[PDB]
Design a protein around this ligand. Structure first.
Ligand SMILES: [Mg+2]
Ligand SMILES: [Mg+2]
Ligand SMILES: [Mg+2]
Ligand SMILES: [Mg+2]
Ligand SMILES: [Mg+2]
Ligand SMILES: [Mg+2]
Ligand SMILES: [Mg+2]
Ligand SMILES: [Mg+2]
Ligand SMILES: [Mg+2]
Ligand SMILES: [Mg+2]
Ligand SMILES: [Mg+2]
Ligand SMILES: [Mg+2]
Ligand SMILES: [Mg+2]
Ligand SMILES: [Mg+2]
Ligand SMILES: [Mg+2]
Ligand SMILES: [Mg+2]
Ligand SMILES: [Mg+2]
Ligand SMILES: [Mg+2]
Ligand code: NA
Ligand code: NA
Ligand code: NA
Ligand code: NA
Ligand code: NA
Ligand code: NA
Lengths: 37, 171, 59, 205, 94, 142
RNA sequence: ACCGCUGAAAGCAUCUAAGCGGGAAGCCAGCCCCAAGAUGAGUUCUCCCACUGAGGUAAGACUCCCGGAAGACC
RNA sequence: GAUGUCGGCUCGUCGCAUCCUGGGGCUGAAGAAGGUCCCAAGGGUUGGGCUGUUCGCCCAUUAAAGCGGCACGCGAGCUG
RNA sequence: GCGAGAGCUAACUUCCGUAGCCGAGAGGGAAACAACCCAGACCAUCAGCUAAGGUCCCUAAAUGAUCGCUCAGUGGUUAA
């Protein structure tokens, strides 16, 4: 879980999911779990 | 958008006030929704219409249609999840109606179902979760899987029948 | 002080102070302004009549 | 829950099996029930209980009246408990067993106006390096121009002692029914002849 | 008020601004704006139908009041006497 | 030259708060306490009517009941003991919510606190009515 | 923090907008002590009572004395 | 017409950019031991040699031997 | 404040040019507050209209009207 203030796509499996006022990204690849919070 | 809704003859849809009550042979099940969202049985099947056509009405539309469908299929056939105990020396027993987990931990894991869900063990290496309400089922099975997450090396614990788990392999 | 009383009076019927004074501006008729508070404090009926007048000289 | 009142009589030696157990002898005299606090009639559940016996010539008219309601006998001490509500009166028999752990509470001996070294341990200052602040005398009390004030509830000279104290988990070594005596492994607070309250194990291991 | 005491009053001698004409019993006619003469509420303008008659009582000199000023750190201290003059009028009208 | 004060006024008004949001209710109460219609209309003495709040436990809010709205309850010397509680976390003492939301909207002088005395909050329906022997004139907000 | 269930807008996917679960030596409560001057001053048991033209008195306490594992004096 | 200076000693309390314990994600994470990041200030954070030292180095240990703030906290508290 | 230098296009910085205010300027507003905004106090008054500002409650004054925005407690501290 890498906390980056700049979350952007890195492949073709990354899906941005807006949660409870937070930026998260789902992906089959567990190394692509970026999150601003 | 979703419209087609399969409503059999063993089901009873009651749209009284805000509390929508559905009767069935597998047991009655109440499901709450919105008041601003229109919904009724037009003719034979059931049709769900939305007030506005932006987003605050469509989201809840899909939501609601889905949920109702689930209630129906729930009181018509019922929902049941198939788990699996993979690994070495892993097993589960039954005490009355509770599930007894035995999987690498020193002391066995007793799991007691809530009101409306029932376990089943047709095999010492396979778990069966049966219930009326789909949500509850999901949540309880979810609790079962939560006990041992399939490790990224051998893939033990609990899994859904033919789960595709990729082993990272350490060496 | 006087104001604080006047808007109370006003409110006792279904109007306010803004509406009430304004309903005496539209009509050069009523130009009390000063002492009005004493009128709303001692003689209720009179002040009722003034209110009714204010509403009548508005809408 | 259950408990009783008694007098700290003293500490003595007492082997149990092959080991020397220090004990503290306590007189749990029979304790009468003088009032039953029903939650309905009061607001909470409880029981009033009496200890040392007094001469009617020393007992206030009102207090006599109190005692008349249950009609036992004028006593010098009354206290209350919780969840305790049996029939008859309060003897330590059937109440405490040998081996049961108990919370023993009483008023400590008080030491009066003790410094900080005694009171709060502290540390005072150097006795040789050239002072005027040897033994006690604390250092500073705060900081400086910021909160030019000392913190509420802080460590200074005061009245040490005279406090309600409850020591937890004490072992009931032996119990002499009929002699209304009880032995408790270890020390209880307060002085000999002091009042002690022996209560059931509240939150135990 | 500002000048000329209207309203409903039952024969009372009040004190207001001077009325120029010095003397006594100088008929003073004033316009009305409100009054409860005989429990009959009457608004403005219409009140013009009725007018108040008052007679001058005396030309009294106000109460003595000292007027003091002060600004700190700059000195400035001022002290001067003052009394604003008036007249009493006996209300006796319709 | 204006109107003197009296004291015959002492109406016992009861404000329901069931569903009403905390603002309207609050301001309304505080307002009637200080002086809604004001008898002699005087600011010297308290002529406000007596306010009785029923329910209160069923007070409504927006969306920040669990969040944002954090009543602060601090001690003598808060040396790391600065107590803070969510607004729903006031199920413990409901009366405190309303009670301690109105006092804030009343003056801070002597007479103010004197006014807080006329504020009487109860959490419940038919029970608070037992605390009501005098007038029971009930007046809804809006 | 993080990890999940049911599940739309992207008639796929998704821990999320409705709703719900699990989860830290932290928070709240639990444990020991204080606490009604909590001037919104609380509750319970018991006692003396319906004088006199400020004062005799009841219940009760104080002063004084002798002491105390209570204490600077109180 | 005065805000007493360094360090120590004494006595504390607070921030979190967390030294140790607590809960997590990720790994070039098999296990064990680690690396890095996120959440988390309840408590704890040893004794000595040299130096006025604050630092720092060293001996011997420790779960750890955190970094700062408070007039580089504290001389109507001490030292000098 | 504007127009420059010096200074890191820092400083409640410094040095010049120009406008206004404070200095010697009360009053209203900006919570408090020399300067900012509105306004230059001869004296008296249980009189009225406005400015800057506001009009739920703590102070006076529409929980005002119509068409939008924002699920944030933004408003009520900043950027790549
Ligand atoms: Mg020493
Ligand atoms: Mg000092
Ligand atoms: Mg201070
Ligand atoms: Mg000086
Ligand atoms: Mg000095
Ligand atoms: Mg942090
Ligand atoms: Mg490992
Ligand atoms: Mg040396
Ligand atoms: Mg410095
Ligand atoms: Mg210093
Ligand atoms: Mg020297
Ligand atoms: Mg300058
Ligand atoms: Mg000068
Ligand atoms: Mg001001
Ligand atoms: Mg005007
Ligand atoms: Mg304007
Ligand atoms: Mg107002
Ligand atoms: Mg903000
Ligand atoms: Na700490
Ligand atoms: Na060291
Ligand atoms: Na420190
Ligand atoms: Na000295
Ligand atoms: Na000037
Ligand atoms: Na300001």
């Amino acid at each position: 879980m890498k906390v980056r203030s700049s979350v952007k796509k890195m492949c073709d499996n990354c899906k941005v999911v807006r949660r409870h006022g937070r930026v998260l990204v789902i992906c089959s690849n567990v190394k692509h779990k970026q999150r601003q919070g | 958008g979703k419209q087609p809704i399969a409503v059999p003859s063993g089901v009873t849809v009651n749209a009284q006030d805000g509390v929508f009550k559905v009767k069935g042979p597998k047991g009655e099940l109440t499901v709450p929704y919105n008041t601003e969202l229109t919904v009724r049985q037009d003719g034979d099947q059931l049709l769900v219409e939305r007030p506005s056509d932006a987003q605050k009405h469509r989201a809840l539309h899909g939501l609601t249609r889905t949920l109702v469908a689930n209630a129906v299929k729930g009181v018509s056939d019922g929902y049941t999840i198939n788990l699996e105990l993979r690994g070495v020396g892993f097993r589960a027993k039954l005490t009355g109606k509770a599930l007894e987990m035995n999987i690498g931990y020193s002391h066995p894991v007793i799991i007691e179902p809530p009101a409306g869900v029932t376990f089943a063990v047709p095999e010492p290496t396979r778990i069966d979760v049966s219930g009326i309400d789909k949500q509850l089922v999901g949540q309880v099975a979810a609790n079962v899987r939560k006990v041992r997450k399939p490790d990224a090396y051998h893939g033990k614990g609990v899994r859904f029948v033919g789960e595709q788990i990729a082993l990272k392999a350490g060496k | 002080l006087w104001i604080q009383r006047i808007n109370a009076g006003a409110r006792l019927h279904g109007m306010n102070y803004s509406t009430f004074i304004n309903g005496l501006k539209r009509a050069n008729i009523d130009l009390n302004r000063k002492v009005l508070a004493d009128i709303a404090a001692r003689e209720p009926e009179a002040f009722k009549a003034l209110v009714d007048a204010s509403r009548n000289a508005r809408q | 829950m259950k408990g009783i009142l008694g007098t700290k009589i003293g500490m003595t030696q007492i082997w149990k099996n092959d080991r020397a157990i220090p004990v503290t002898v306590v007189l749990a005299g029979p304790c009468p029930i003088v009032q039953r606090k029903t939650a309905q009639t009061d607001g909470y559940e409880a029981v009033q209980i009496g200890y040392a016996p007094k001469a009617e010539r020393k007992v206030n008219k009102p207090m006599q009246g109190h005692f008349a309601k249950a009609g036992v006998a004028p006593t010098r001490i009354l206290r209350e408990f919780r969840g305790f509500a049996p029939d008859g009166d309060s003897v330590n028999v059937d109440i405490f067993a040998e081996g049961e752990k108990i919370d023993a509470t009483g008023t400590s001996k008080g030491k009066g106006t003790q410094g900080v070294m005694k009171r709060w341990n502290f540390a005072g200052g150097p006795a040789s390096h050239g002072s005027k602040k040897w033994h006690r005398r604390p250092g500073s009390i705060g900081q400086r121009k910021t909160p030019g004030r000392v913190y509420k509830g802080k460590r200074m000279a005061g009245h040490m002692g005279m406090e309600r104290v409850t020591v937890q988990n004490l072992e009931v070594v032996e119990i002499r029914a009929g002699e209304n005596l009880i032995l408790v492994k270890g020390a209880i607070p307060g002085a000999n002849g002091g009042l002690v309250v022996l209560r059931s194990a509240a939150k135990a291991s | 008020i500002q000048t000329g005491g209207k309203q409903y009053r039952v024969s009372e001698g009040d004190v207001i601004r001077v009325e120029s004409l010095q003397g006594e019993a100088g008929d003073k006619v004033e316009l009305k704006a409100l009054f409860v003469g005989g429990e009959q509420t009457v608004f403005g303008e219409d009140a013009g139908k009725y007018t108040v008659q008052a007679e001058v009582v005396e030309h009294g000199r106000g109460k003595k009041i000292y007027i003091r000023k002060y600004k700190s750190g700059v000195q400035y201290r001022r002290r001067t006497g003052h009394r604003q003059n008036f007249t009493a009028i006996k209300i006796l009208g319709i | 030259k204006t109107y003197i004060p009296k004291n015959d006024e002492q109406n016992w008004v009861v404000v329901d708060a069931s569903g009403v949001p905390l603002g309207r209710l609050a301001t309304l109460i505080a307002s009637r306490i200080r002086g809604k219609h004001r008898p002699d209309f005087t600011p010297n003495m308290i002529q406000g009517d007596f306010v009785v709040v029923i329910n209160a436990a069923q007070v409504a809010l927006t969306g920040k009941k669990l969040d944002d709205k954090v009543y602060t309850r601090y001690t003598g010397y808060q040396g790391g003991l600065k107590t803070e509680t969510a607004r729903e976390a006031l199920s413990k003492h409901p009366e405190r919510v309303i009670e301690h939301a109105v006092f804030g909207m009343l003056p801070k002088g002597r007479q103010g606190r004197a006014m807080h005395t006329r504020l009487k909050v109860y959490a419940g329906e038919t029970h608070p009515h037992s605390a009501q022997k005098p007038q029971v004139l009930k007046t809804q907000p809006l």
